[PDB]
Amino acid sequence: GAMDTLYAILDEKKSELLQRITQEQEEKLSFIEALIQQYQEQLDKSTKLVETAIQSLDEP
Amino acid sequence: AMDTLYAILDEKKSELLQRITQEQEEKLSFIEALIQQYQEQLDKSTKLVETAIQSLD
Amino acid sequence: TLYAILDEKKSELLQRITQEQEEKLSFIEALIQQYQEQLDKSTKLVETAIQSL
Amino acid sequence: GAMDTLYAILDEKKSELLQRITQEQEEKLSFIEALIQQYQEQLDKSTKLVETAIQSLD
């Protein structure tokens, strides 16, 4: 009947919505991971610069 | 009747869509837990760095 | 009077070592300030970026 | 020799002035060294903190 069709459609819509939300969340996750990596690298570079400058100051 | 036949078919289609929806929910649940964990790690890190910054003042 | 001579030299030596160490302190202070500024910039950037999500 | 004496007194005086100047130089220099050492220690504590932040992001 028409009511069975309607519910099947709503279930399909539910799966499609989950799919859309998932893709957007996956994008969110990737951006977060690329952000953490860049931050980490910035923090690492700066600290290595600093520890090298001090180590070399008290020397050469 | 095409009714009883189409009914059994619809049951199996429905089961398959349920299986797919279940898997989708699992995967989305995992992505979201990961996003929260990374955000918390990022938060802790910025706090540690701000402590570092202030300790140089 | 000989110790006056030796104390003049010591004073001149103290003066040069002092300028060298002042320079050292100057470099350290600037290095530290530079570190702080970079740490801070990186941190503000990441938080801003997070906020834009 | 009135002029000799004046020089002698002045001779004593410069030595005394010198000893005060030297003592002050050492006090300034020692202070500068403490300040350097203090800063180097803060910077070390600071870098380990950033290292812990970096390790957190793993």
Numbering used by the authors:
A (entry chain A): -3 to -1, 214 to 270
B (entry chain C): -2 to -1, 214 to 268
C (entry chain D): 214 to 266
D (entry chain B): -3 to -1, 214 to 268
Can I see the authors' text?
To gain an insight into the assembly of the CC-prone segment identified, we elucidated the crystal structure of the corresponding fragment from human MuRF1 (MuRF1CC) to 2.1 Å resolution. These assembled into two parallel dimers, each having an ‘open scissor’ conformation that intercalated through their C-terminal ends to form a palindromic, inverted tetramer. In MuRF1, however, the chains within each dimer are out of registry by one full heptad-repeat and their crossing angle is broad, leading to the unpairing of both N- and C-termini. One additional salt bridge (K238-D268’’; chains DA in figure 3a) is present in the structure, but it contributes to tetramer stabilization. The analysis revealed that MuRF1CC can establish manifold interactions, being able to support concurrently the formation of parallel and antiparallel dimers and tetrameric helical bundles.
Muscle-specific RING fingers proteins (MuRFs) are E3 ubiquitin ligases that associate with the sarcomeric cytoskeleton reportedly through their CC domains. MuRF1 targets components of the contractile sarcoskeleton; namely, myosin, troponin-T and titin. Despite their functional diversity, TRIM proteins invariably share a tripartite fold consisting of a RING finger (R), one or two RING finger-like B-box domains (B) and a helical segment predicted to form a coiled-coil (CC) motif.
